[PDB]
Amino acid sequence: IIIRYLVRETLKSQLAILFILLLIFFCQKLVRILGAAVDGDIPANLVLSLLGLGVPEMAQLILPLSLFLGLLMTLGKLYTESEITVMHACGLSKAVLVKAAMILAVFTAIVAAVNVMWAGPWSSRHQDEVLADQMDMRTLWNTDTDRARAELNWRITLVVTVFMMALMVVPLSVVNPRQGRVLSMLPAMLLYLLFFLIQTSLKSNGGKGKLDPTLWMWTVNLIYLALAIVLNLWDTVPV
Amino acid sequence: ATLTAKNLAKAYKGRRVVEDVSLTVNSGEIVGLLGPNGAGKTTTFYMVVGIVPRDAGNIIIDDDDISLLPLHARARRGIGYLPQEASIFRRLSVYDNLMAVLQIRDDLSAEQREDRANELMEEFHIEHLRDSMGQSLSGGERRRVEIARALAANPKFILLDEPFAGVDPISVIDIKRIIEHLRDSGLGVLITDHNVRETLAVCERAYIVSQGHLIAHGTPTEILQDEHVKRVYLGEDF
Amino acid sequence: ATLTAKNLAKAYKGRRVVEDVSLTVNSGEIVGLLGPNGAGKTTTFYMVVGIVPRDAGNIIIDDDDISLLPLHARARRGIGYLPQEASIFRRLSVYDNLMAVLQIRDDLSAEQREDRANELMEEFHIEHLRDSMGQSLSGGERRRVEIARALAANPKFILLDEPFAGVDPISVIDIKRIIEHLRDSGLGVLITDHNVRETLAVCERAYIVSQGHLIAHGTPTEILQDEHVKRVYLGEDFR
Amino acid sequence: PFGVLDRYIGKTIFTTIMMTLFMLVSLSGIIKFVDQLKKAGQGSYDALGAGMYTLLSVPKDVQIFFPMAALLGALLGLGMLAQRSELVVMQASGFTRMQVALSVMKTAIPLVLLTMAIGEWVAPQGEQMARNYRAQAMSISGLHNYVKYLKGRYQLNMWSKIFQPLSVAVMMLMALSFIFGPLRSVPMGVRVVTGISFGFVFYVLDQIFGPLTLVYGIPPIIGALLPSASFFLISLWLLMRKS
Ligand SMILES: CCCCCCCCCCCCCC(=O)O[C@H](CCCCCCCCCCC)CC(=O)O[C@@H]1[C@@H](NC(=O)C[C@@H](CCCCCCCCCCC)OC(=O)CCCCCCCCCCC)[C@H](OC[C@H]2O[C@H](OP(=O)(O)O)[C@H](NC(=O)C[C@H](O)CCCCCCCCCCC)[C@@H](OC(=O)C[C@H](O)CCCCCCCCCCC)[C@@H]2O)O[C@H](CO[C@]2(C(=O)O)C[C@@H](O[C@]3(C(=O)O)C[C@@H](O)[C@@H](O)[C@@H]([C@H](O)CO)O3)[C@@H](O[C@H]3O[C@H]([C@@H](O)CO)[C@@H](OP(=O)(O)O)[C@H](O[C@H]4O[C@H]([C@@H](O)CO[C@H]5O[C@H]([C@@H](O)CO)[C@@H](O)[C@H](O)[C@@H]5O)[C@@H](OP(=O)(O)O)[C@H](O)[C@@H]4O)[C@@H]3O)[C@@H]([C@H](O)CO)O2)[C@H]1OP(=O)(O)O
Ligand SMILES: CCCCCCCCCCC1=C(C)C(=O)C(OC)=C(OC)C1=O
Ligand SMILES: CCCCCCCCCCC1=C(C)C(=O)C(OC)=C(OC)C1=O
């Protein structure tokens, strides 16, 4: 029951950020498309429909982010109303806070995988079909085993980050009444920013070839995953 | 049982807020922990519950050390907490949030959940609210549910936190009635608040702590007779 | 002078929280405004001050209607408001708080403010602290500088909001000795706190409201022996 | 005229504007820095855009971050005075509401005289060598007479820079109407979220509905004045509503 209360409450705040963070990304995708239309190609055409083919590419960021931002807004809302302090003052653990952040993360993972397998390729095949080897964006998920800069990893590191950002929020959305409610997100929001600045500057900096998922792209995914466990299992002896 | 709290201490940035307080409570006995707002009363109460981790101290619930445990593990072995502000589950029915705690106690069968939940709605007069959600009740109706589900965890020594908190004097004649009800079921209540004209009427013995150490204890007719409390707190009370 | 109020009315959405409340405070006279919570006793108080705009009322000081006026123009007719919070200017020294509002009055010449300020710091026995800021004064100087600052704007009907409001019963003698001193300078005062044990022990009249309107307006010995107020309010034992 | 309340209500707003703008340009420095070393490797390690994009591109970023950090500090600094209950007690002593308005606007005179100071001498001179120090390893005076070397898209760029200080003074006017408008002792979290919402709407309304007016048909001088005047009318309507 208390899991079905937590999943039903974050989902109404996750399906609301998905239509709020959409306007931020739609407008930002519309700023850069006007620079290539007031001086680029003639805009008697695609400018509405080309924007509609950018949504499964911008869904690679707003789908892990809406779960990350959704668990901050709800658990921040339930601590300050003293509903989680009274949750485990009458007998339950922090596991029910973790077993509610993963039964929800399974929902967003199978939308992130269906977005990154044969939905991103479907639009990028059609995006160049309206403007009428080394592609790595049209290329479907099976034949990413060929050669040098196959970026199968940035197509697989954003399905893992749906699960792993769901584990960093339940120990970091504790709110101290000294710091207030809006200041207890800057530990968590800056930590999300430090993840996608490294994940992007190891894909494009490592695509042309200096450092690849051999000793650099999956060690930052694992120092940042083991951080999500030692921060979550602080209730023991120190090591 | 015989919850005992010996030698509690704490340091906040070098400052000493509490040193060597010794308060006990037996079953079927309301003890009070009050004092002036110098840290004292507040931080000592948040160690018996367990939201504040101790510096050095020993809490035992009548046989066993629980002092190194969190709040949530202490709720399995007894102790049940009531927050000060409104802590009913806001979007859930009254029967649901009375059941969402009752689904966790694992020494019951699935047909014993429905009798025990029905035994609590009849006891606290909430049978006429079994479908209504939260955030739609009054300060005398929400407070009934907040106890009716913290009693559903099978506790010993419910310890309430400021359960007067600003309320008119006609609605303290029933807050005192459900508190004297819990004494008549074998649960030693530990009350702590600001409203000192009422807890000295309901308690059997109080623990006035002030400026660190515990300064006096005993029956409330010995409290007003004492002169040493009278310089820091309760100037010319009655 | 006198401050009288005539037939207050206030309705937010449908329900009328205030329905025809009238009071009269004279000079040199404490009078409480009491009642249960949500019965309008915090709404008919703020209508006298002017935070919430009245609807059908008539607030009158001795020979001027002020019912249309906002708070900033009502504070020059001789009305002083003291909120139930800290309300000390934090990053401004305790001399400057009694100087920042002495410069508001225009009938005081430039030299005539400093001897008035040193008079106020001497009268409330706070002369010894002059350079302390206000972020760190006391619990007992967060209540004496507020009065010595709201007295500096030359009030006539200083309106307290919850003076006791959770202090020690040893500090209810020191925040009561300066309320009776506040009326000794010819200054009516309207307490409206919640803790009904000491507002009846300091005042001379009361105005207990219940859900829209007055119930009794006598001295405290005409209220504890009343029968109608002992059912929606205090109870059956108050000896 | 410059009392004690005048030098205190206009000082907290000056620091919280000046120390928000530092916290927004440093965040726009770091995520511009790691953008400019995924290009390095052409004879330039801290020289392409990594190292010397700190004095050469930061005065450009205190011009596109300056209006939405002027709505902000006049909301996060003035909202601080309303949270700890010092703005209702200024009115309860005689300091009126049009004197609060008169004292936040006196703060804006160092602000708008600084922005057109470094919007003419420092920002284009920095940004001009911000490309030369990159391309080697791979104003109002200077932009007025170039309107006749065409014989559109550039006259909008000049005319949206003269009353760009007017975009700063309108933001503190809108941030003042929110404090005397939907205030309700609303917590500090919402004043952060209504400071980003109308802050982001300004950035969209400046760069979308600037050129979109020009493409259809308009004089360019009113398309530059649209993102400030449409935020002057919202502040004016919000002021004359609760009375
Ligand atoms: C709810 C709360 C939270 C909300 C969060 C919301 C988040 C929204 C995010 C939206 C964006 C998401 C993006 C994404 O998705 O996520 C990415 C990942 C990270 C995501 C993180 C997300 C989560 C965050 C979470 C936070 C916590 C919650 C990032 C991205 O996107 O990263 C990158 C992006 N990032 C950003 O902008 C930062 C991003 C980061 C994200 C946002 C972070 C926000 C955080 C907010 C919260 C903070 C909380 C604490 O923020 C922005 O945007 C800001 C947007 C507004 C934000 C508002 C935020 C607040 C909102 C609040 C709302 C309520 C970057 O931009 C760079 C700068 O651009 C302008 O600079 P300038 O203006 O110019 O100065 C900006 N100006 C501006 O923005 C203006 C703005 O007004 C300024 C700011 C305004 C602020 C407004 C504020 C409002 C405030 C309101 C109040 C607060 C700068 O601004 C900046 O810095 C911005 C500044 O910091 C500010 C930032 C924001 C600050 C915010 C503060 C907030 C404060 C409050 C809150 C605290 C900006 O940095 O571009 C990169 C791609 O570019 C490249 C590349 O590098 O690969 C090169 C491009 O070409 C150019 C160039 O354009 O420069 C020119 C070329 O000529 C060349 O020179 C080249 C290089 O030099 C070469 O060496 O460079 C182009 O090339 C291709 O096309 C060209 C042409 O056709 C079209 O152009 C061709 O030209 P040509 O052919 O010649 O025509 C090219 O040809 C060359 O190359 C060919 C090939 O080689 C190419 O290669 C292929 O072929 C090879 C083979 O051939 C051989 O092998 C292969 O080998 C290769 O592998 C490959 O296959 C050759 O072919 P051959 O012939 O040789 O074969 C050819 O010959 C020739 O050589 C080529 O083909 C391109 C293309 O994309 C794909 O093809 O690719 C992107 O990488 P990407 O990721 O990879 O794409
Ligand atoms: C986290 C930083 C951005 C916060 C943006 C506002 C979030 C609150 C508004 C969205 C929301 C809407 C519109 C909403 O309608 C809604 O309805 C039931 C919510 O429920 C939980 C919402 O969260
Ligand atoms: C229009 C382009 C900018 C959009 C900015 C986001 C607007 C939606 C999110 C903010 C928001 C929140 C958080 C919110 O809580 C809220 O509550 C009632 C809103 O009401 C209208 C909001 O707008």
Coordinates of N, CA and C in Angstrom, one line a residue, chain D residues 9-21 24 65-81 104 107 111 168 171-176 179 188 191-192 194-196:
Chain D
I9 N 17.8 48.9 2.6 CA 17.0 48.2 1.6 C 17.5 48.3 0.2
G10 N 18.5 49.2 0.0 CA 19.1 49.3 -1.3 C 20.5 48.7 -1.3
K11 N 21.0 48.2 -0.2 CA 22.3 47.6 -0.1 C 22.2 46.0 -0.2
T12 N 21.2 45.4 0.5 CA 21.0 44.0 0.3 C 20.6 43.6 -1.1
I13 N 19.8 44.4 -1.8 CA 19.5 44.2 -3.2 C 20.7 44.4 -4.1
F14 N 21.7 45.2 -3.7 CA 22.9 45.4 -4.5 C 23.8 44.2 -4.4
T15 N 24.0 43.6 -3.2 CA 24.9 42.5 -3.1 C 24.3 41.2 -3.7
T16 N 23.0 41.0 -3.5 CA 22.3 39.8 -4.0 C 22.1 39.8 -5.5
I17 N 22.2 41.0 -6.1 CA 22.2 41.1 -7.6 C 23.7 40.8 -8.0
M18 N 24.6 41.4 -7.4 CA 26.0 41.3 -7.7 C 26.6 40.0 -7.4
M19 N 26.1 39.2 -6.4 CA 26.6 37.9 -6.1 C 25.7 36.8 -6.6
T20 N 24.6 37.1 -7.3 CA 23.9 36.1 -8.1 C 24.6 36.1 -9.5
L21 N 24.9 37.3 -10.1 CA 25.5 37.4 -11.4 C 26.9 36.7 -11.4
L24 N 26.0 33.1 -11.7 CA 25.5 32.6 -12.9 C 26.6 32.7 -14.0
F65 N 23.3 37.6 -19.2 CA 22.8 37.1 -17.9 C 22.4 38.2 -16.9
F66 N 22.6 39.5 -17.3 CA 22.3 40.6 -16.5 C 20.8 40.9 -16.2
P67 N 19.9 40.9 -17.3 CA 18.5 41.1 -16.9 C 17.9 40.1 -16.0
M68 N 18.1 38.8 -16.3 CA 17.5 37.8 -15.5 C 18.2 37.5 -14.2
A69 N 19.3 38.2 -14.0 CA 19.9 38.3 -12.6 C 19.6 39.7 -12.0
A70 N 18.7 40.5 -12.6 CA 18.2 41.7 -12.0 C 16.7 41.6 -11.6
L71 N 15.9 40.7 -12.3 CA 14.7 40.2 -11.8 C 14.9 39.4 -10.5
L72 N 16.1 38.8 -10.4 CA 16.3 37.7 -9.5 C 16.8 38.2 -8.1
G73 N 17.8 39.0 -8.1 CA 18.3 39.6 -6.9 C 17.4 40.5 -6.2
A74 N 16.6 41.2 -7.0 CA 15.5 42.0 -6.5 C 14.3 41.2 -6.1
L75 N 14.3 39.9 -6.3 CA 13.4 39.0 -5.8 C 13.9 38.1 -4.7
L76 N 15.2 37.7 -4.8 CA 15.8 36.9 -3.8 C 16.4 37.7 -2.7
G77 N 16.6 39.0 -2.9 CA 17.1 39.8 -1.8 C 16.0 40.5 -1.1
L78 N 15.0 41.0 -1.9 CA 13.8 41.7 -1.3 C 12.9 40.7 -0.8
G79 N 12.9 39.4 -1.3 CA 12.1 38.4 -0.7 C 12.6 37.9 0.6
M80 N 14.0 38.1 0.8 CA 14.6 37.8 2.1 C 14.1 38.7 3.2
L81 N 13.9 40.0 2.8 CA 13.4 41.0 3.8 C 11.9 40.8 4.1
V104 N 14.5 51.0 -4.3 CA 15.1 50.0 -5.1 C 15.5 50.5 -6.5
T107 N 19.0 51.9 -6.3 CA 20.0 50.9 -6.5 C 20.3 50.7 -8.0
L111 N 23.5 50.1 -11.4 CA 23.4 48.9 -12.2 C 23.4 49.3 -13.7
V168 N 17.2 46.3 -17.8 CA 17.6 46.0 -16.4 C 16.6 46.7 -15.5
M171 N 13.3 45.0 -15.0 CA 13.3 43.7 -14.3 C 13.1 44.0 -12.8
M172 N 13.8 45.0 -12.3 CA 13.6 45.4 -10.9 C 12.2 45.9 -10.6
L173 N 11.6 46.5 -11.7 CA 10.2 46.9 -11.5 C 9.2 45.8 -11.5
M174 N 9.5 44.7 -12.3 CA 8.7 43.5 -12.3 C 8.9 42.7 -11.0
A175 N 10.1 42.6 -10.6 CA 10.5 41.9 -9.3 C 9.9 42.7 -8.1
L176 N 9.6 43.9 -8.2 CA 9.0 44.7 -7.1 C 7.5 44.5 -7.1
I179 N 6.5 41.3 -5.3 CA 6.6 41.3 -3.9 C 5.4 42.0 -3.3
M188 N 10.4 30.8 0.2 CA 11.5 31.1 -0.6 C 11.7 30.2 -1.8
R191 N 9.6 31.7 -4.9 CA 10.3 32.9 -5.4 C 11.6 32.5 -6.2
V192 N 12.1 31.3 -6.0 CA 13.2 30.8 -6.9 C 12.6 30.3 -8.2
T194 N 9.5 31.2 -9.5 CA 8.9 32.3 -10.3 C 10.0 33.3 -10.7
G195 N 11.2 33.1 -10.2 CA 12.4 33.9 -10.7 C 13.1 33.3 -11.9
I196 N 12.9 31.9 -12.1 CA 13.4 31.2 -13.3 C 12.4 31.2 -14.4

